[PDB]
Design an enzyme around this catalytic site. Structure first.
Site, PDB file in Angstrom:
ATOM      1  N   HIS A  75       0.816  -1.204   0.000  1.00 48.50           N
ATOM      2  CA  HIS A  75       0.000   0.000   0.000  1.00 48.50           C
ATOM      3  C   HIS A  75       0.842   1.243   0.000  1.00 48.50           C
ATOM      4  CE1 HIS A  75      -3.142  -2.885   1.278  1.00 48.50           C
ATOM      5  NE2 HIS A  75      -3.809  -2.169   0.392  1.00 48.50           N
ATOM      6  N   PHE A  77       3.002   4.336  -2.837  1.00 49.57           N
ATOM      7  CA  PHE A  77       2.781   5.228  -3.962  1.00 49.57           C
ATOM      8  C   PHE A  77       2.748   4.506  -5.318  1.00 49.57           C
ATOM      9  CE2 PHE A  77       4.398   8.055  -7.304  1.00 49.57           C
ATOM     10  CZ  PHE A  77       3.292   8.901  -7.371  1.00 49.57           C
ATOM     11  N   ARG A  78       3.554   3.467  -5.494  1.00 49.72           N
ATOM     12  CA  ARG A  78       3.508   2.713  -6.747  1.00 49.72           C
ATOM     13  C   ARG A  78       2.147   2.025  -6.959  1.00 49.72           C
ATOM     14  NH1 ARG A  78       7.762   1.674 -10.000  1.00 49.72           N
ATOM     15  NH2 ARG A  78       9.123   2.029  -8.190  1.00 49.72           N
ATOM     16  N   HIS A 115      -6.722   7.300  -2.948  1.00 51.49           N
ATOM     17  CA  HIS A 115      -7.566   6.352  -2.234  1.00 51.49           C
ATOM     18  C   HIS A 115      -6.853   5.529  -1.127  1.00 51.49           C
ATOM     19  CE1 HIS A 115      -5.546   3.334  -4.475  1.00 51.49           C
ATOM     20  NE2 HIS A 115      -6.101   2.465  -3.647  1.00 51.49           N
ATOM     21  N   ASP A 116      -5.527   5.539  -1.096  1.00 51.21           N
ATOM     22  CA  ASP A 116      -4.782   4.817  -0.075  1.00 51.21           C
ATOM     23  C   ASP A 116      -3.791   5.701   0.685  1.00 51.21           C
ATOM     24  OD1 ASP A 116      -5.737   2.234   0.318  1.00 51.21           O
ATOM     25  OD2 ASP A 116      -4.664   1.486  -1.489  1.00 51.21           O
ATOM     26  N   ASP A 225      -8.597  -0.782  -8.291  1.00 51.68           N
ATOM     27  CA  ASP A 225      -7.861  -0.975  -7.050  1.00 51.68           C
ATOM     28  C   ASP A 225      -7.312  -2.400  -7.000  1.00 51.68           C
ATOM     29  OD1 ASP A 225      -6.823  -0.458  -4.443  1.00 51.68           O
ATOM     30  OD2 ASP A 225      -8.772  -0.720  -3.490  1.00 51.68           O
ATOM     31  N   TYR A 247       0.432  -8.826   4.402  1.00 51.65           N
ATOM     32  CA  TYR A 247      -0.448  -9.722   5.119  1.00 51.65           C
ATOM     33  C   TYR A 247       0.278 -10.415   6.293  1.00 51.65           C
ATOM     34  CZ  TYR A 247      -4.214  -9.868   1.590  1.00 51.65           C
ATOM     35  OH  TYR A 247      -5.290  -9.656   0.781  1.00 51.65           O
TER      36      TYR A 247
END
Ligand SMILES: Nc1nc2c(ncn2[C@@H]2O[C@@H]3COP(=O)(O)O[C@H]3[C@H]2O)c(=O)[nH]1
Ligand SMILES: [Mg+2]
Ligand SMILES: [Zn+2]
Length: 328
Positions: A75, A77-78, A115-116, A225, A247
Site C-alpha cells: 500500500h 505510492f507505486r 484512495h490509499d 484498485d 499480510y
C-alpha cells in the site's frame, strides 16, 4: 528514437503512448517519473483545461500526495500509480468520455490517486481488533478509507496544493462528495453489498440515472484498485509478494498480540498460488464479467489475462503441492 537524450522525468513519446494501455510496466519507473505520468494524465484528459487547474499547483499537489504515501510493501505510492494508470486505461478502453462528464472523470482520477493515502500497513480488522486510535476515531466504520479521504482533503486545503482552487464552490462540493463516495467504496468489506447493488441496476441500466452512475463509478474504482492480475504476468507477479509481505506482517502481529487471525493472511495456510486462484476466480473474474456487460471490449483486454493468470496459478499450485509432498 530522438536526436538527443532527455531527462527521465521528460516522458518519451513512446512512454506517453504506452501509458494509455493496461500493459504499461509500472515497475520501470521511479517516483519522479511516475509523478510526470500522472501529471500528463490530467493534461491529456482535458482536466487542466476544463477546471482551470494551475499547472504548477498540479505538480505540487502530486508531490505532496506522493510524500503522504507511506513506504509499505503493497500500500504505497507505486500502488496508487497503478490504480490511477488503470483508471486512465479504462477511460480509453471503455470510451468513458462519451458517457461521463469531465467532473466525473476528475472524481474518478483524483479518487484513484488519493484512495490509499497514509496507509499504516495493517488493515481495518487489525485497527478494529487492536482498538487503535484510528478505529476509535472512526467508530469502527471503514476507518482506513475514512482516513485516506480525510488526508486527501487536508492536502487539498493547503493553498499551494489546491488543484480545485479555480472551481466554483458548488463544483467543489460535487467533486468532494463524489470522491468521498468512491474512496469509501474501496473498503473490501463492502464488496458483496456494492456488487449486489450494481447488479440490481444492471437489470435495466440507465446512464442518465445519477444513482446508476454513482454505482458504476464505485465499480470502476473498485476494478482499478484490485486490477493487478489484469496486467501482463511479468508486471503482475511481483505485486503478489508485496501483498503477502503486508499480510504476514499483520498476521504475525495479531498472533503475537493475542488477536484474531484471518486464514487468508496466515503464513501457515497461504501461498502465492492459493491466494491468487481464489481471488481471481471468485472476486476478479465475476466483477469484470459484470462490467463487460456494459463494456464488451473489457472481455478481450482484461478477462483474457485473468483466465490466463488463473490457469497458470493452478499449474503453480500443482508444483507447490508436490514440493510439500517432499517435506513431511
Ligand atoms: N489475493 C489477492 N488480493 C488482492 C489482490 N489485489 C488486491 N487484493 C485485495 O483486495 C483488497 C482491496 O482493499 P485493500 O486495499 O484493503 O486490500 C486489498 C487486498 O486484500 C491480489 O492480487 N490478490
Ligand atoms: Mg484501500
Ligand atoms: Zn488500494
Amino acid at each position: 528514437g530522438s536526436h538527443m537524450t532527455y531527462p527521465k522525468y521528460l516522458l518519451s513519446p513512446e512512454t506517453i503512448e504506452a501509458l494509455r494501455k493496461p500493459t504499461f510496466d509500472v515497475w520501470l519507473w521511479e517516483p519522479n517519473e511516475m509523478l510526470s505520468c500522472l501529471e500528463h494524465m490530467y493534461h491529456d484528459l482535458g482536466l487542466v483545461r476544463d477546471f482551470s487547474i494551475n499547472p504548477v499547483t498540479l505538480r505540487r499537489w502530486l508531490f505532496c500526495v506522493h510524500d503522504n504515501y507511506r513506504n509499505n510493501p503493497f500500500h504505497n505510492f507505486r500502488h496508487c500509480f497503478c490504480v490511477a494508470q488503470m483508471m486512465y486505461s479504462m477511460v480509453w478502453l471503455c470510451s468513458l468520455q462519451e458517457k461521463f462528464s469531465q467532473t466525473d472523470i476528475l472524481i474518478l482520477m483524483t479518487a484513484a490517486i488519493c484512495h490509499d493515502l497514509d496507509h499504516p500497513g495493517y488493515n481495518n480488522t487489525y485497527q478494529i481488533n487492536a482498538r487503535t486510535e484510528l478505529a476509535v476515531r472512526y467508530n469502527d466504520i471503514s476507518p482506513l478509507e475514512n482516513h485516506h479521504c480525510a488526508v486527501a482533503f487536508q492536502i487539498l486545503a493547503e493553498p499551494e496544493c489546491n488543484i480545485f482552487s479555480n472551481i466554483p464552490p458548488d463544483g467543489f462540493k460535487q467533486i468532494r462528495q463524489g470522491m468521498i463516495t468512491l474512496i469509501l467504496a474501496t473498503d473490501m468489506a463492502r464488496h458483496a453489498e456494492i456488487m449486489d447493488s450494481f447488479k440490481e441496476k444492471m437489470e435495466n441500466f440507465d446512464y442518465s440515472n445519477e444513482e446508476h452512475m454513482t454505482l458504476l463509478k464505485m465499480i470502476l474504482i473498485k476494478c482499478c484498485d484490485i486490477s493487478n492480475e489484469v496486467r501482463p504476468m511479468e508486471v503482475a507477479e511481483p505485486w503478489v509478494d508485496c501483498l503477502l509481505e503486508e499480510y504476514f506482517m499483520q498476521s504475525d502481529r495479531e498472533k503475537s498480540e493475542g488477536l484474531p487471525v484471518a486464514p487468508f493472511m496466515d503464513r501457515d495456510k497461504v501461498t502465492k498460488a492459493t491466494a491468487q486462484i481464489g481471488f481471481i476466480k471468485f472476486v476478479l473474474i465475476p466483477m469484470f464479467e459484470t462490467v463487460t456487460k456494459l463494456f464488451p471490449m473489457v472481455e478481450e483486454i482484461m478477462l483474457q489475462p485473468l483466465w490466463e493468470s488463473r490457469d497458470r496459478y493452478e499449474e503453480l499450485k500443482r508444483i507447490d503441492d508436490a514440493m510439500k509432498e517432499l517435506q513431511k
